[PDB]
Design a protein around this ligand. Structure first.
Ligand code: HEM
Ligand code: HEM
Ligand code: HEM
Ligand code: HEM
Lengths: 146, 141, 141, 146
């Protein structure tokens, strides 16, 4: 993290308009649809075979809410982006063995979902800051492959 | 691969992108240059600035080549050939950059087309671009 | 793409790998399971142990499918089809794993064939495997 | 890094047989040949167009020696793998703008070159430790994209 004072603000002033409950699951839904190998990990979940049945999965919307949760814990605790996630990193790496590049895919689709919802106010320099937050959050979860 | 119906979501999503394709291809350069600064290496002769006529002029080119992939999509290899010799022989673009531009491009379809941009179409557009990049890197392989 | 002469380095490098192909395909599984443990997820029903008859039996399969790519190389799509539906529909292997197995496979050609394994042939073998993986992930795209 | 006592030894007992002067350049040579976009960065160098002209480039062998050098500084200073490379990271990231995944390619081909030279004594568990060192060295150079 660095987040120049003028990046920090564009990021902070987006999130407060974010309907976490219904964005977290637009993202986790899009993840299983665009990158289907991720479905392997969610077979505890139900019917994931056609894109409608995912975006309308009460589970997929439930779990996603936990996920915008930990982006919230990151988006404003950026000082140790590493330390807020230690346990989750322990959960994703040496428990579920999710390869680190999925961590980038998820943050990337999150950005597509941030763009999809906010349209023109997701201006390029306001994107450029989110690619920094996301890349950081993704370097943090992956800290236990070392 | 690029199924009968992915071929349909792309011919449609680009269908309503129409008139704007050139503004969009240039918005997505601006996004790539901003977010992933490691790509600026290749355009030292561009003003990588917001108003820049060069990036705005190049948006037209990237958008022209995307169109000539949307139409001829059942045969990308032949159509995109000289761009798959320019980027791969002449320029030597690291193929990881193609992933990034594909992503900014999607963040641009998203930010301008919310109703089209259904999850299935996000998948199709991604599958489309993943094939454009595969074509663009095929001298490499 | 897979030029007239890359097609020649692979038909030759695999040529002298001959009799051993099955031992080698199994050495490279062992290497992948050891070095990048995140791949063990897919073989919970294997003894991912050194002497394991399953990994040694599977080495034969991976090596059989590599051969049936070395021969028919001018047409990977058609030949590898049912392995490009097994891995991509049935199994859902994360395509980043294909890069890793391709790498262990090269560390195995290297460790057993030093004189063959000239820098040009390292390139050819890599280009070959990059095409096998591209075929193996093509339902995905 | 972790390097279990029994990994640490297989790694340390390889390197001392390593002819640094002529391995560093087998690797940097193989890099420009198998992954040619890297050539963009070495146009200060000379003829790189056919694989023979690279493996016999006095420059390519010279520069590679600096590179097995910084693997040596890593292979036995593993405690801060981060700190031995700060300046080099500053050199590769925000000077030459080399994308972080080339850092993995280079360590990967190094392993192909370690295997090529030592044959059967490059046993799988002795490889598995080098993929850890290399991945670490590669996480360290890249520390300034954050
Ligand atoms: C920014 C990236 C990510 C964040 C912040 C995140 C966050 C979370 C959180 C908060 C949980 C639940 C924590 C708890 O139960 O208390 C979780 C669980 C899980 N995540 Fe992620 N995740 C991320 C990426 C991924 C990716 C890429 C995958 C790959 C498919 C994945 C697969 C899973 C799975 C399968 C679980 C199941 C939890 C369980 O054991 O019940 N996650 N994640
Ligand atoms: C969707 C993928 C891409 C498409 C369709 C595309 C298309 C094009 C086209 C049509 C041209 C000019 C054609 C001509 O003048 O004959 C071009 C030039 C160029 N492209 Fe791309 N490109 C893509 C991705 C990239 C990426 C990722 C890079 C990253 C460095 C890149 C770097 C360049 C450069 C440096 C030039 C030349 C600029 C100049 O010297 O005028 N392209 N591209
Ligand atoms: C060079 C690339 C690869 C080739 C040529 C290859 C080839 C094969 C072949 C021929 C089979 C069995 C065919 C049959 O029984 O009909 C197979 C099965 C399988 N492969 Fe691969 N494979 C490759 C890479 C991978 C990778 C990277 C993974 C990573 C998870 C993987 C996971 C599997 C699994 C899980 C099975 C089934 C094992 C079992 O249930 O018996 N393969 N592969
Ligand atoms: C393990 C990974 C790597 C290590 C340890 C490494 C190490 C070094 C060292 C020690 C130097 C010279 C330091 C000095 O001049 O005092 C250097 C320079 C350089 N490296 Fe790397 N390198 C690595 C990966 C890469 C990669 C992947 C590239 C991409 C092509 C690259 C491109 C360069 C270039 C172009 C220079 C020129 C130095 C100059 O400005 O004169 N390096 N590297």
């Amino acid at each position: 993290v660095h987040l120049t004072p003028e990046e920090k603000s564009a990021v902070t002033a987006l999130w407060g308009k974010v309907n976490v409950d219904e964005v977290g699951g637009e993202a986790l839904g899009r993840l299983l649809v665009v990158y289907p190998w991720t479905q392997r990990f969610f077979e505890s979940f139900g019917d994931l075979s056609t894109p409608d049945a995912v975006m309308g999965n009460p589970k997929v919307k439930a779990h996603g809410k936990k996920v915008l949760g930990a982006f919230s814990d990151g988006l404003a605790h950026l000082d140790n982006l590493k330390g807020t996630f230690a346990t989750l990193s322990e959960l994703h790496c040496d428990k579920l063995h999710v390869d680190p590049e999925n961590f980038r895919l998820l943050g990337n689709v999150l950005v597509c979902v941030l763009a999809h919802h906010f349209g023109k106010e997701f201006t390029p320099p306001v994107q450029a800051a989110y690619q920094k937050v996301v890349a950081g959050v993704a370097n943090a979860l992956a800290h236990k492959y070392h | 691969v690029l199924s009968p119906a992915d071929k349909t979501n792309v011919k449609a999503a680009w269908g309503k992108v129409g008139a704007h394709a050139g503004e969009y291809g240039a918005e997505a350069l601006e996004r790539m240059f901003l977010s992933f600064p490691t790509t600026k290496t290749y355009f030292p002769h561009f003003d990588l600035s917001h108003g820049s006529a060069q990036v705005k002029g190049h948006g037209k080119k990237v958008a022209d080549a995307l169109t000539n992939a949307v139409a001829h999509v059942d045969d990308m290899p032949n159509a995109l050939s000289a761009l798959s010799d320019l980027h791969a022989h002449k320029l030597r673009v690291d193929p990881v950059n193609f992933k990034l531009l594909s992503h900014c491009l999607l963040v641009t379809l998203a930010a301008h087309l919310p109703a089209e941009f259904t999850p299935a179409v996000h998948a199709s557009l991604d599958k489309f671009l993943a094939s454009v990049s595969t074509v663009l890197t095929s001298k490499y392989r």
